[model samples]
Target: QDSLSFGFPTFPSDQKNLIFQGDAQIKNNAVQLTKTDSNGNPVASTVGRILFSAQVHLWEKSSSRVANFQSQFSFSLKSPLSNGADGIAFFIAPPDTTIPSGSGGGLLGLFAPGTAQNTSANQVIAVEFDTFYAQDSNTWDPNYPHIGIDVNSIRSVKTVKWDRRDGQSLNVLVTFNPSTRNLDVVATYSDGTRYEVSYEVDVRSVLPEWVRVGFSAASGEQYQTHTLESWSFTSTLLYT
Candidate 1:
């Protein structure tokens, strides 16, 4: 019974409906999702999050109808060093959720330490643009700049190379269809290079009837800056 369409060319002057966490703030006309040091370099070991401070209607419990959603946003990730570590995400999570303390860099500010596993309390779905080659007993990250679909876990179910080049501003489009349970993500570089990946996920099983959607990023020992330029989202639920 409800559908919402809105776009932000820049953050509103009045931020009554927005929540900023960690180093995330309104910088100039865009959302600066991380902080820079006194040297004007990206800060390491920081988690940045900015949320649209409302619960989005994801589905109807009684009728069991779920919304099909589409969202697009533009961002730039600039590394201050020779290589960038960790990454950013477009995510949907349980209502009013806060960043996990010490989510520290690699977890992408989505899950708490040791809780990346799919579980009731760890409900989150995201499209991650990762640039690190993390290897440990706990992770199976790919060895390149890649796009991954995460369902309540940092371990990606499907991954594809992002083909990211230096100094490229990226545009991301995300779409979800409930009937087919397909989540598609497309990342386009300013030079017209595009990376796409689609995964089947039942959000009904991973998220609540209502959710919070927003952007998140983090830094490891190496650091990068994330600037969000614009975002737009629309959703609908219709039966065949």
Candidate 2:
């Protein structure tokens, strides 16, 4: 369900021209995705990221939904952090099996207000690596994008302010620990230094087990490729 080092496929004709179809198509044991408009403007989706997915059925038997289920990942964006659409996320939901479109602003193509209405909050829990500020008034904050947690709604529980330190991707390992009932997010800059933020919350009681776990990214009107370098997940049951 995880790997320490991995890479996507490249065309034999020319190693420079990488080929990605942007669906559930598994290449080299990883999913590939990309979205584009009629005019060829690159859209966002769950592609270009190495995802680690698992079934929650086993954990469900031991404990009913306490507060929510947890999803974890070790990843970094291929795009620049300053790019309007550069970020990844921990997704928990039902599997569409097919590819989905990328929502704007590093949301990994997961923000669709209309479709999100029918989705159950108790059925989904996403801790977004939010890079764009979609909220009111604050929308144009030069610090537009940051990281935060999303629980089925457009609202974020927490966010961090940042600036583009370099033309580099960030390395991070995020974990939602159900047993401790806390969200632990850690990030390492390209220079090797690191930082972390923890949010207090009980997950087992919020969502049930047996949900879908994956990552998502998107490039909207601003257009940027939010790529997922790698991801992983591990789970345990708890009763509160």
Candidate 3:
């Protein structure tokens, strides 16, 4: 059973088969994506990512087989100055994926800084909880706060406004149906408000038989803290 499965009630000190890159850390008993300074204030512009150390068997190498998967995680976002830029995402990336340089801010730590504007050629798919209206990026971010389905690029294929006024506990459930090629997302806030969205994209088309799964986040010029409290994921193969 090479199918991937794991759960973290709270990220432990000696977490197994887990990787933290850049500024990401297990702080305050959770996976803190963005950095915090000495006094617990959000640090300057930074980027971070956390992921399972092992690559998931997303599909069969020799056959037309793919895995249907589900991921649920608890997260909280807050900013003192109401300036929450760049946000976070639960992403599925190609094997051996690494943090792109200059991926901070609206880049979401997924795309590399482009000298010439075009498709990022990024072989990644993600569900984004974007909090900033980045007027500068080529990707037209919708409104102030929103949920989006991002494939290969930061520009979400489908977007929805989120109903989160202040820093309240939130949870997200993301599911992938390989047969239908539908990626669905549901986000619920502490106040019982919920946002649901879906997009159609074949994960096998962008990734290989094996893929890495995790959370990526960044704080641009306008900064904030993004933390993941709990997380669980499981995948089952669908043989052809």
Candidate 4:
């Protein structure tokens, strides 16, 4: 069985194979990603960020590869004050299980400050739900609060904004098909509005054959709470 699945109702206690870094925790039967401590107190500001990853590799090192996979998750970002800053992402990264230092705000807890921009060699592929718009970053448009597919850079290959609000339950579905080299995403809001997008990516070109899969989030000077209500993922191994 080359698959794994779990969600809240109880805290995730597989500490031996599940890793939590920075401000991530389980609270209220959900994975609290940032802005709150174990006791649920606000502890995030401009530099606040969090990361959670399965310590085990998604695939065996000697396995042929992974070509097809589907992931679905429910999440919400609630701003205690005004607008929320930064956002969240699901990613497949190299084996290292550490959160990058100086990675917060627009960096979204994924890359160290100035690292990705200089090397363009980040070893990951991510789908981001971005909310902040810093003019200096030059990465956001008027249609922000959008979804983007990112390779090595924060600049998105494709992005689209949809109907969203604080505390609204949002669901996301992501599917990857190797034959077509297509990655598709569908997002549905609580009000029944649906948004969909697709992009072409050669996963083998960006990520290792055996990679870690997980979530990361952050808050900038403007803070908010990010929570993962539920998540499930299944992948089909490809043998050549």
Q: How many pairs collide in each candidate, listed in order?
A: 0, 21, 0, 0
Where model 1 places Cα greater than 4 Å from the true spot, the runs are 118-121, 136-138
TM-scores of the models, in the order given: 0.93, 0.63, 0.94, 0.85
Worst 10 residues of 4 by lDDT: 47-56
Regions of model 3 farther than 4 Å from truth: 115-120, 137-139
List model 1 lDDT by residue over 162-197, tens digit each: 764556678889999887889999888867888889
lDDT of 2 by residue, 93-151 (tens): 65433234434443355555344434353245566665555544224223555566666
User: What tens-digit string does per-residue lDDT give for candidate 4 at 1-240?
Assistant: 565555433345344445677777666777777857555544555333233344323444566455577878888888766567778888878877467777877888887777655425688788888888767763543446788888887777888885557888789999988677799999998778898989998787777766777788888677677788877776776653
Better of 3 and 4 by TM-score: 3
Candidates ranked, most accurate by lDDT first = 3, 1, 4, 2
The best candidate by TM-score is: 3
> Which one is best on lDDT?
3
* Model 1 lDDT, residue 201, Cα: 83
Q: How close is each model in CA RMSD to the real structure?
A: 1.9, 6.7, 1.8, 3.1
Ranking by TM-score: 3, 1, 4, 2
Model 3 agreement with the true structure over 30-101: per-residue lDDT tens digits: 888999887767876889999898889988867678899999998888777776766889998876888888
